[PDB]
Design an enzyme around this catalytic site. Structure first.
Site, mmCIF file in Angstrom:
data_model
loop_
_atom_site.group_PDB
_atom_site.id
_atom_site.type_symbol
_atom_site.label_atom_id
_atom_site.label_comp_id
_atom_site.label_asym_id
_atom_site.label_seq_id
_atom_site.Cartn_x
_atom_site.Cartn_y
_atom_site.Cartn_z
ATOM 1 N N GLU A 1 57.441 -26.171 -1.607
ATOM 2 C CA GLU A 1 57.289 -24.859 -2.190
ATOM 3 C C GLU A 1 57.278 -23.734 -1.134
ATOM 4 O O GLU A 1 57.046 -22.570 -1.471
ATOM 5 C CB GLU A 1 56.104 -24.848 -3.164
ATOM 6 C CG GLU A 1 56.436 -25.568 -4.475
ATOM 7 C CD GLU A 1 57.534 -24.832 -5.249
ATOM 8 O OE1 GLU A 1 57.458 -23.574 -5.315
ATOM 9 O OE2 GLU A 1 58.470 -25.506 -5.756
ATOM 10 N N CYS B 1 53.044 -15.217 -7.353
ATOM 11 C CA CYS B 1 53.498 -16.241 -6.433
ATOM 12 C C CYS B 1 54.364 -15.611 -5.365
ATOM 13 O O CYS B 1 55.087 -14.742 -5.666
ATOM 14 C CB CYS B 1 54.232 -17.371 -7.097
ATOM 15 S SG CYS B 1 53.100 -18.339 -8.150
ATOM 16 N N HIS C 1 59.729 -21.653 -5.828
ATOM 17 C CA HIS C 1 59.998 -21.508 -7.239
ATOM 18 C C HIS C 1 60.230 -20.080 -7.733
ATOM 19 O O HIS C 1 60.611 -19.917 -8.845
ATOM 20 C CB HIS C 1 58.982 -22.219 -8.112
ATOM 21 C CG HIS C 1 57.692 -21.503 -8.267
ATOM 22 N ND1 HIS C 1 56.550 -21.888 -7.622
ATOM 23 C CD2 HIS C 1 57.344 -20.476 -9.057
ATOM 24 C CE1 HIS C 1 55.564 -21.108 -7.985
ATOM 25 N NE2 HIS C 1 56.024 -20.228 -8.839
#
Ligand code: NA
Ligand code: NA
Lengths: 173, 173
Positions: free
Chosen positions: A56, A132, A32
């Site tokens: 992911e 992230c 993402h």
């Protein structure tokens, strides 16, 4: 032991987060955070990259040496229950924030509407949205092993989740 | 001993080169890499910064804590003849390249038409144009001291020069 500077030097600003050079040609990150609508990554056109994505977890294999200064290191699909890892967080300011986390189960979990194959963990003694893609690493003997990339956390940050490579196995289904 | 990750984390991309957080509010860099025509540095308007420049040495003192994660460390005007320093070079790729250099005389030297107050040194056992602003550091007891910022090198790279703070003294005129 503490992560050495070279290990930190693998953590790299990318898209809306970070990624990690596993070797001179292999870069891993969280799906993402990957920029959308682009025609190249790190100056390399998309057609010169082998791009693998599973949930992911995203891996790029570049056709040229992007970080020839680095040795290859081991990437594994998560780690055993109870393994203490370090999340090598870099902040935009330059601050390094290694976070200790005791890892739990590898599972496919629903996170914000989506199924995500990953490993959850408990923060010891936190993360923010821009973190992230930061790697989850642990030391095995004299070497460091990377086994996931930061993907999610509970609002408090006490439970975290790293995305891990696809693959089924009897310790995880 | 080797520069620790936190020390590296002070080295920061800036303008056409790099700079170095001496403390949460003090940033040093090489004058010629400072961007020209801007109205802010690191999101802070120019009028909120105390900007000191002497030849090729530039120091910013921000009015707010920009790197509150850092301790202050010692900045000195160059170092004694013969001191072995490390130039903490970061490359755009993320590579860390600490270069050992045995330092020589502090002097005002003509470099490409301009007089530059700095310290020359010999590269041991090199730099490139994008490395300007990288700090010259050395370990004193258990702590690191910063004493200059990369400003110039001979074409080969064998002799380097770090800009140093203004100041006259009997070991340097
Ligand atoms: Na350390
Ligand atoms: Na080291």
């Amino acid at each position: 032991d503490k992560a050495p500077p070279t290990l930190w030097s693998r953590v790299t600003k990318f898209g809306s987060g970070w990624g990690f050079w596993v070797s001179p040609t292999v870069f891993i990150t969280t799906t993402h955070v990957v920029p959308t609508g682009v025609k190249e990554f790190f100056g390399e056109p998309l057609s010169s990259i082998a791009i693998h994505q599973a949930g992911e977890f995203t891996q790029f294999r570049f056709s040229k040496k992007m970080r020839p200064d680095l040795t290859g290191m081991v990437l594994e699909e998560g780690c055993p229950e109870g393994t203490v890892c370090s999340v090598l967080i870099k902040r935009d300011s330059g601050e390094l924030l290694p976070l200790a986390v005791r890892m739990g189960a590898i599972a496919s979990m629903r996170i914000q509407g989506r199924l995500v194959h990953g490993q959850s963990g408990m923060l010891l003694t936190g993360t923010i949205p821009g973190d992230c893609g930061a790697p989850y690493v642990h030391k095995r003997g004299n070497d460091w092993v990377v086994c996931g990339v930061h993907a999610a956390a509970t609002k408090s940050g006490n439970t975290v989740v790293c995305a891990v490579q696809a693959g089924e196995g009897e310790t995880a289904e």
